[PDB]
Amino acid sequence: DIQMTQSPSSLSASVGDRVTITCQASQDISDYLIWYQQKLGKAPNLLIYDASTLETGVPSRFSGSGSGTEYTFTISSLQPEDIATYYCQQYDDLPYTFGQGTKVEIKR
C-alpha cells in the first residue's frame, strides 16, 4: 500500500563519475528505507538501512540521504564493480514494497 517511485530506470556514466538515484514514498516512512545492489544473476545485497546507515564492509563511496518521503542514493565515484541494479525498499509497513530499480552501467 505504500508506493515507491524510483528514478531513473537506467543510466550510463563513466568510471569516476557521480551517480544520483532517488526514491519518493507515497507517505512518510519514518526513515525506514533500505538500498540494495543486485548484480546480474544474484540476490539483492543490503548496502544501507535506516535510509542513511551503511552496513559493514560497504565502500564509503556509497551513501544515502533523505527524510520523510524523498530519499536519494549517491555513488560518489563509479567503479566497474558497481554495475548492477539498485533498488530502494521501505520496511515501515507490510507489505514491504520496492521501487522499480535503477540499472547502472559504465559507458565506454
Side-chain angles (χ1 to χ4, degrees):
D1 199 65
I2 292 185
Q3 219 71 261
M4 301 303 301
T5 297
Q6 190 180 320
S7 178
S9 306
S10 56
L11 78 248
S12 300
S14 298
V15 331
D17 278 338
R18 184 185 174 203
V19 173
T20 313
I21 294 166
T22 58
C23 273
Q24 180 169 257
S26 58
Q27 100 182 230
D28 224 299
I29 56 170
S30 324
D31 284 339
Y32 301 124
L33 181 73
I34 182 285
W35 293 96
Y36 300 95
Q37 175 186 49
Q38 184 183 23
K39 298 177 173 301
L40 196 60
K42 312 196 190 64
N45 315 311
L46 192 151
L47 305 183
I48 292 164
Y49 56 108
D50 208 89
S52 54
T53 171
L54 255 72
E55 182 55 86
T56 79
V58 175
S60 257
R61 87 190 83 129
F62 291 118
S63 55
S65 45
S67 318
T69 29
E70 271 282 81
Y71 300 87
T72 78
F73 168 92
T74 312
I75 295 172
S76 72
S77 196
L78 193 67
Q79 284 187 22
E81 82 254 28
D82 288 346
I83 297 176
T85 293
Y86 297 83
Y87 292 98
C88 63
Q89 159 174 257
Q90 58 83 19
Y91 57 112
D92 173 54
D93 198 61
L94 288 177
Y96 293 167
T97 42
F98 288 75
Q100 278 207 319
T102 308
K103 171 57 199 155
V104 342
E105 309 165 50
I106 264 94
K107 85 158 303 177
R108 323 177 308 236

